[PDB]
């Protein structure tokens, strides 16, 4: 698919054709539009002094 198509919120459906299941299941995959963007914050937690005892 194209990058612009995914950002446009188009509805895509994958249909499975399996011999065991008489009914082809429908799975819908789409990017949820209307969500805000936030800047992630990366924090690094060093190990505590109570963990560096058993070596």
């Amino acid at each position: 698919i194209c990058e612009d198509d995914w950002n446009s919120g188009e509805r895509f459906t994958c249909t499975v054709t399996h011999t065991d299941l008489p009914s082809p299941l429908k799975q819908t995959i789409s990017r949820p539009k209307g969500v805000a963007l936030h800047r992630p914050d990366v924090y690094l937690l060093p190990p505590a002094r109570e963990q560096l005892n058993l070596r």
Partner: protein, 97 residues
Amino acid sequence: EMNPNVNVFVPPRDGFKSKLICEATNFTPKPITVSWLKDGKLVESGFTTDPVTIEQTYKVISTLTISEIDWLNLNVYTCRVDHRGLTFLKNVSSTCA
């Protein structure tokens, strides 16, 4: 003048490509036309009609080539029988569905 009986056979539930058989029996006169449909669409190839035999009654059978994937995808197959200006349609589907 008796209306022909329409019967459509299906592959076994536990597995068998396969063939579809549509049988018209106890019909008169001998001339009769049998066709096949796929999801309401005309079929242009992949079907053959055997010569009419004598069972007075007559028997005519038809053979349609189908694939395992298409048949099990809940596709609609209809046998069309035309006799004395009357059209008979029989619809079949998966029993285990």
